[PDB]
Amino acid sequence: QDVDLYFQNIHGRLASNETFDIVPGLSKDGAVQYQTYQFNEAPKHLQKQVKAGRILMERFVAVASAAVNKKAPSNKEKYHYDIWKEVSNQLIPAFFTDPIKGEQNLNTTVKGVEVAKSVIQFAGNVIAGNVTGFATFLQNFGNGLSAEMNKTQANYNYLYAYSTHDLFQDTSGNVFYKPRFLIYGTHFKQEQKKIATSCASYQEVNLEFGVDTVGGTFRIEEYFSNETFKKKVDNFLDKYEGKAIDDADSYFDDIFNGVKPNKNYVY
Numbered sequence: 001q002d003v004d005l006y007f008q009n010i011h012g013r014l015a016s017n018e019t020f021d022i023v024p025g026l027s028k029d030g031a032v033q034y035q036t037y038q039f040n041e042a043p044k045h046l047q048k049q050v051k052a053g054r055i056l057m058e059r060f061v062a063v064a065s066a067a068v069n070k071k072a073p074s075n076k077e078k079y080h081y082d083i084w085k086e087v088s089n090q091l092i093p094a095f096f097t098d099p100i101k102g103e104q105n106l107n108t109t110v111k112g113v114e115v116a117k118s119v120i121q122f123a124g125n126v127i128a129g130n131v132t133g134f135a136t137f138l139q140n141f142g143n144g145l146s147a148e149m150n151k152t153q154a155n156y157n158y159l160y161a162y163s164t165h166d167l168f169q170d171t172s173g174n175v176f177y178k179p180r181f182l183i184y185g186t187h188f189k190q191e192q193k194k195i196a197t198s199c200a201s202y203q204e205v206n207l208e209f210g211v212d213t214v215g216g217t218f219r220i221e222e223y224f225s226n227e228t229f230k231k232k233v234d235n236f237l238d239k240y241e242g243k244a245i246d247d248a249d250s251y252f253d254d255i256f257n258g259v260k261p262n263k264n265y266v267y
Contacts, residue, residue: 025250030079062242081185096216112201129258
């Protein structure tokens with residue numbers, strides 16, 4: 001309920017004219033890429049849980065985004081990672097476990113046509129297979145992104161506000177479902193802006209980004225076993241509901257096939 005009070009203060013409602021505005025996905029002041037990644041189809045006995053988990057996480061993402069939108073003193077500050085981090089540090093202790101924080105780095109040199117794969121693999125700590133659908137999404141979105149970032153010489157703020165839905169084998173060969181809520185933040189410096197139109201190129205591109213991270217694993221087990229926990233989740237989500245992230249221009253979802261964890265993945 002300390003989370004409830006935090007959010008009550010920011011906003012001082014399920015009707016579509018009453019739900020809270022979210023931070024616009026693409027702007028001259030920065031972009032927020034709203035995403036839902038599912039890694040592998042769920043086995044028969046987990047499919048219901050996964051479909052519910054995906055809905056829950058998209059709602060949590062829109063709740064965080066709506067708080068930021070309200071809390072930001074100016075349009076520019078809607079794209080300031082530190083405000084996203086402040087709001088997530090309120091959600092995580094309340095509804096999540098295994099909190100993560102701190103910087104990560106993407107320092108790699110790949111062909112333009114491999115950039116989309118590099119993004120997914122970094123976003124999830126995974127070895128991906130076919131990501132051609134996401135590659136088409138990112139390529140087309142890159143046109144809009146490039147247009148905005150090239151308007152001035154300034155750094156262009158760039159955030160991923162997303163969830164991952166992991167269906168991977170434990171050591172005993174049994175599939176588990178891990179739903180994660182993640183907010184990552186970086187920027188494009190002037191010399192990096194070229195990257196946004198390089199997804200069709202077979203030429204090499206240097207990806208050097210310092211990425212600030214915050215996130216946690218959702219208590220999906222307790223949500224389906226503990227009725228009083230299910231209730232605080234549902235009531236909170238109902239009260240502070242943001243506009244659907246699936247209506248944003250920056251939105252993409254997919255079920256990626258043939259995926260396994262990489263050596264950075266934490267079980």
